[PDB]
Each structure stands twice: as C-alpha cells, then as structure tokens.
Amino acid sequence: LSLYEKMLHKGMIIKNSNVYEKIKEIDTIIFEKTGTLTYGTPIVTQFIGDSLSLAYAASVEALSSHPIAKAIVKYAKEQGVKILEVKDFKEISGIGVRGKISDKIIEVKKNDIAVYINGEPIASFNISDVPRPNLKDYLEKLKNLKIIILSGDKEDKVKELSKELNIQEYYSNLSPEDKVRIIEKLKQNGNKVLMIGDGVNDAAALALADVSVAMGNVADIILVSNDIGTLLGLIK
Ligand SMILES: [Mg+2]
C-alpha cells in the first residue's frame, strides 16, 4: 500500500518514513497536559456571580475562538441565557476580551477568570481541562521509556492530572521557552525524545523534539484523528 497511506488509515499524517524507525530509537515521551492528555476544549467547573453577569461575559466571549471563550459560551448557553449584542469588541488572545453592552463596559480576563463591569470585578469562573479516557496505554509504555508531562498550568492542576493518569515526572507553570530549554537539556543528556503537543503554544519545543507529534486540534506526525491511544498503541 505505502507507509504514507497505511498511516493515514490509522489517522496519522507522516512527514518522512524516517520518523518510522526513529520511533524505535527514542526513549523519552513527553506530553503537553493541555490538548493531548485532555480534550482541546476546557469546561467551566464553577461560576460565581449573578445570571446577568453570566450573560454579559458569554456575550463578549462569543466573539472569540479561544477554547476558554468557547467553554464559557457553552456553559452560559446550557444555563439558558441568550447572547446579547456587543459593540467595540477587543481581544488579546489567551489573556482577555472586552466589549460594550447596554452602555456598560465588560471585560473577561485571566479562580481562573474574572468578569469586570465598568472596572469592578463582579463574577468569576473556575475552568478546567477534561482528561481523555484510556489509561492502560500508559502502563504498557511505562513497561517498554520515561514519560513526562509539561504544562503552562498551575502546580495543583498539573499534579492532580499526574495523580489520576499515574505519572511521576511532570513540570508546571512552564512558558513555551521553559519547555524548549527542557527539550534541549534532555537531548543534551542523550535522550531521544518524542513529544506530543498542540502544535502552536509549544511549536518550538516540538521543533526540537527528536520526533514530534502535533494534534489535529511542520511536526513529524500529525494526529488528524486526535487518537492518542492509537499513537501510544503504535509506540508500545
Ligand atoms: Mg463549559
């Protein structure tokens, strides 16, 4: 058939056949918490504030394509509130959004998210990543090979996910640049490192991985399917 076509069938897009046997020569596996071990879109785990505030925040968040923004919009919609007309929308990706509704200035910006109305913090959200099911693939590889979780998220969130999925080595509160330095150090130390990430917020780290995998949500392997199990199946 052809390696390239066989891999597509399994929802992997490969860049070079070399990545193939290179898989066997690697010894370290690194996961990005967000998007790989968890779904690409987080959920609202709690909202504190009144329903008008909720409608205001969702109405502004409805103009962003950020996953946190989508988590907030979905939660508000499940609560039954309707989207309101916003003017003067402004966004700074991943950090905050702003807009005007009913003569009032609303800001939603990085509990995890505060809602301001005319300068005053009046509501907030806790949002969390949702883990992907399938937990045995991990042990299998822990058999055959060291696993590491990296994340720009806070200690307690990262640790807790490490706890659930049963992963020992993990680093938290990392900037993209922290991750890149970690890869280089592993490679300096002699490790052949395969990394799985979102493909953007950690593109430099991937670019340095011995073999890099991007989620479907440049890299050596693109997981169109977002099927990590099948990737870990292959590796294992
Ligand atoms: Mg949600």
From TrEMBL:
Domain of life where this protein originates: Archaea
Amino-acid positions noted as binding ATP 2 in the UniProt annotation, renumbered to this chain: 34, 61, 66, 152, 179, 201
Residues holding AMP: 61, 66
Binding site for ATP 1: 33-34, 61, 66, 151-153, 179, 201
Subcellular location per the Swiss-Prot or TrEMBL entry: Cell membrane
Chain sites annotated for binding Mg(2+): 71
Signal sequence range: none
Record-stated family: Belongs to the cation transport ATPase (P-type) (TC 3.A.3) family. Type IB subfamily.
UniProt name for this protein: Copper-transporting ATPase
Species the sequence originates in: Saccharolobus solfataricus (strain ATCC 35092 / DSM 1617 / JCM 11322 / P2) (Sulfolobus solfataricus)
Residues of the full protein shown: 385 to 633 of 695
